[PDB]
């Protein structure tokens, strides 16, 4: 059976990474032709002696940005925002400031020109975040240079929230997650689910969870189970099978906005021409693309067959999601220890290419 063939493939390619990087726990999911396969290894909690299972909640880290993107696509297609609007229109305390000449799409796709990977260490309180954006001044020409930025998509998320007259946590938990059919996906894990919330483990194998941070939720703050992430990949593979509002939201996240070498930047998702070589997928995670600013080029020819992926990490967790529309296949990897991005991409590449 397919069940045993997939289990064997994941056992050969993913299971060895547990001994190699000393990973307490892992969840790997495959969806093929609307059939879900769930593999669980090791411990959700070392001290509590809890096995990883279908209820285990993991930190998605930067894979959170896919839900922020989906929320933006939902708001835009319900006419709550336009991608040509500026933050001042919704956050009135930023009206007539320099950041108010950056549009929402530029914030969402990291092209503000002067927003780094992280906020400064001193930015913490709601007031210090508002001050940081009021005191913001341009550097590189607005819209020309991609620099991967938590603050950038953070502000986009806050604006999307204001546009729908809810806090961001409520936008996901009350609108987007239910619309996608996600039952155990959280910005804030409730008291009744804390026994299902995995500990992350650092490079010394000490337990750690993600700390509150300035505009954390939209950038890296979402937690989910393997079954919920498999449902999210199913939605991305079959957006036609969902209500108009969320279908339009999903399709909005799949549209390439600009290009950097072999990579097309969509809303949240990273987009590639399919078939993609292993090295094209590894290049997306290169220090050059991730750490440093890069000149963006216009889309000349939109690739006819596309493929999408996203890596994510916190101090304690690793995440990788990938889906190929034309093959009706996708994969999710969740670990409660950071492993190198290259090892996640390579393992996923072998499994997806080998599946019949
Ligand atoms: C999304 O996953 C981003 N990661 C983060 O913002 C966090 N960690 O990033 C690293 C670079 C690992 C760090 O040590 O700060 C993060 C969020 S909350 C928390 N406790 N850590 C991007 N991910 C990576 C990555 O692959 O790890 C990056 C290279 C740059 S930011």
UniProtKB/TrEMBL annotation:
Please spell out the taxonomic lineage of the organism that makes this protein.
Bacteria, Pseudomonadati, Pseudomonadota, Gammaproteobacteria, Moraxellales
SUPFAM superfamilies given in the database record: beta-lactamase/transpeptidase-like
GO BP field = antibiotic catabolic process; response to antibiotic
Q: Does the keyword DNA-binding apply?
A: no
Which UniProt key words apply to this protein?
Antibiotic resistance, Hydrolase, Signal
The protein's GO terms of the molecular function aspect are: beta-lactamase activity
Q: Gene3D superfamilies annotated for this entry?
A: DD-peptidase/beta-lactamase superfamily
Every copy of the Beta-lactamase-related domain together lies at 10-354
Q: Which NCBIfam families match?
A: bla_class_C, blaADC
PROSITE patterns attached to this UniProt entry: BETA_LACTAMASE_C (PS00336)
Q: What is this protein called in UniProt?
A: Beta-lactamase
Name the EC number(s). 3.5.2.6
Q: State the family it belongs to.
A: Belongs to the class-C beta-lactamase family.
Name the chemical reaction catalysed here.
a beta-lactam + H2O = a substituted beta-amino acid
Top-rank EC class of the record's enzyme: hydrolase
What cellular-component terms does GO give this entry? outer membrane-bounded periplasmic space
The record's annotation in InterPro entries points to: AmpC, AmpC-like, Beta-lactam-related, Beta-lactam/transpept-like, Beta-lactam_class-C_AS
């Amino acid at each position: 059976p397919k069940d045993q063939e997939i289990k064997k493939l994941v056992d050969q390619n993913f299971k060895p990474l547990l001994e190699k990087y000393d990973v307490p726990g892992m969840a790997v999911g495959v969806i093929q032709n609307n059939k879900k396969y769930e593999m669980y290894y090791g411990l959700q909690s070392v001290q509590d002696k809890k096995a990883v299972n279908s209820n285990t909640i993991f930190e998605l880290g930067s894979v959170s940005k896919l839900f922020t993107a989906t929320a933006g696509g939902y708001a835009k297609n319900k006419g709550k925002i336009s991608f040509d609007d500026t933050p001042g229109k919704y956050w009135k305390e930023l009206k007539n400031t320099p950041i108010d000449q950056v549009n929402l799409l530029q914030l969402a796709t990291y092209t503000s020109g002067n927003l780094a990977l992280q906020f400064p260490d001193e930015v913490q309180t709601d007031q210090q975040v508002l001050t940081f954006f009021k005191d913001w001044k341009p550097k590189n020409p607005i819209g020309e240079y991609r620099q991967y930025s938590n603050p950038s998509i953070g502000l986009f998320g806050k604006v999307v929230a204001l546009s729908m007259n809810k806090p961001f946590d409520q936008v996901l938990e009350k609108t987007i997650f239910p619309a996608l059919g996600l039952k155990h996906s959280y910005v804030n894990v409730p008291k009744t689910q804390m026994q299902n919330y995995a500990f992350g483990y650092n490079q010394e194998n000490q337990p750690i969870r993600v700390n509150p941070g300035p505009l954390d939720a939209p950038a890296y703050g979402v937690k989910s189970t393997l079954p919920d992430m498999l449902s999210f990949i199913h939605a991305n593979l079959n957006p036609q099978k969902y209500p108009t509002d969320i279908q339009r939201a999903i399709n909005e996240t799949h549209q390439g906005r600009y290009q950097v070498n072999t990579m097309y930047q969509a809303l949240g998702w990273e987009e590639f021409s399919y078939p993609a070589t292993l090295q094209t997928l590894l290049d997306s995670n290169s220090e050059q693309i991730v750490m440093k600013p890069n000149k963006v080029t216009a889309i000349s020819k939109e690739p006819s067959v596309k493929m999408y992926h996203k890596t994510g990490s916190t101090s304690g967790f690793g995440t990788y999601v990938v889906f190929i529309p034309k093959e009706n296949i996708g994969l999710v990897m969740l670990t409660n220890k950071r492993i190198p991005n290259e090892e996640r991409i390579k393992a996923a590449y072998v499994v997806l290419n080998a599946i019949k």
